[PDB]
Amino acid sequence: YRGKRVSFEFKDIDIQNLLRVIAEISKKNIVVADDVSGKVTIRLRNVPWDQALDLVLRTKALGKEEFGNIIRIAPDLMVNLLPVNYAVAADMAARVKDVLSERGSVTVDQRTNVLIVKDVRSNTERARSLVRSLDTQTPQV
């Protein structure tokens, strides 16, 4: 769960293809089962892959299990990184969980106090507006 930064753009492609593509980029050797799912659409910018993966899982796709050398996977939206300069990322977690409800979309907290969201643009926009708005009362030190 650490990698080079990437931008994932997938317009109506088999998750098996996204997976292989992700193995061809040295993001492990990835192998599915045979019939995992189908086709998905995502479009990410500035996301390390191992995250764009966790995030792909939550879209439609699978869960991942690693043997070590190989990993087995079994059965636009966008991603944007939000810097949080002023507040701690965990203090947002209550409010951010409360927008999601039983929706799709997710939020991931990286160690360097940045939030990452996959979702539809409309749920991304909401999550950014709240994260920045709560960050903004934190900049007045």
Binding site: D91, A93, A94, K97, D98, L134, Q137
Partner: protein, 158 residues
Amino acid sequence: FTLIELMIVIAIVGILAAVALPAYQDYTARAQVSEAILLAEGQKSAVTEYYLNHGKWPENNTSAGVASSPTDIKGKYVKEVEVKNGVVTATMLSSGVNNEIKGKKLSLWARRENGSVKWFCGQPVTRTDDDTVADAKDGKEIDTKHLPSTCRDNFDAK
């Protein structure tokens, strides 16, 4: 040949308990929350006075002049009550409560009316500035269904 009156009436009281189960289980939780609210209040006094006398919200319990220890303001279903910049939050214990409300909490916060203040009651909130708070969104918030009609206030209620 005969005995079905004893068999059905033992099985109607069994299903009666199953129907009476969720009613007593939210009436029950709704009752355990109504107290977190009572424990939260009565601490409005300290906080109100501190604010009106100094023009600044009490930073913590000790500032407000209350059990310097959050855990010292607990109850049966309340694991505590902390004052954080005038905002008073009540946490639900983990033992003796419903099931979907334990470890969950609410908040009471006030607003400068100028010469006095007005209090609000609702889901957890954080104070930003002396006259602004926000959803203490934690997913730890007591679910709207368990909150009285008098404690449905939103972070921006005026």
